[PDB]
Design a protein around this ligand. Structure first.
Ligand code: OSS
Length: 131
């Protein structure tokens, strides 16, 4: 599991990349690895609001269907419609082409409660080690 240096991470294995007025959201390399082959993604409609810590979509693999929760609150301004044709982009590039939603974050300080990269790598170590 690759973990990128400038993202913030939630315990449930979703990342946020923040770039000013916009925050992009996807699930991590860890998350796709443990999901297996992703066969379907349920993404929200544009204009919808997402709230920090609440499911905004689901990702269906050959073995599981999990909720993907929003790491921060805001408004879905854009959705990766690429995931309809190739869902697998989540497996092949969880941090670049497999991004799920782009939001306009409504509460910026939310970023400060998320895990930075060493805290998330460590938590993933503790999870891998918990079996
Ligand atoms: C197979 O049974 C694995 C279930 C899928 C687990 C992964 C879901 C990530 S989608 C982001 N919410 S994460 S590993 C277990 C929980 O930390």
């Amino acid at each position: 599991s690759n973990v990128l240096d400038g993202l913030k991470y939630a315990p449930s294995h979703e990342w946020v990349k923040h770039e000013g007025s916009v925050a992009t959201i996807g699930i991590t390399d860890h998350a796709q690895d443990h999901l297996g082959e992703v066969v379907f993604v349920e993404l929200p409609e544009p204009g919808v609001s997402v709230t920090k810590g609440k499911g905004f979509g689901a990702v269906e693999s050959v073995k599981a269907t999990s909720d993907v929760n929003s790491p921060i609150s805001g408004e879905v301004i854009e959705v990766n419609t690429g995931l309809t044709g190739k869902p697998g982009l989540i497996n092949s590039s969880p941090y670049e082409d497999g991004w799920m939603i782009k939001i306009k974050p409504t509460s910026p300080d939310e970023l400060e409660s998320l895990l930075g990269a060493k805290e998330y790598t460590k938590f993933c170590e503790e999870e891998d080690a918990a079996h």
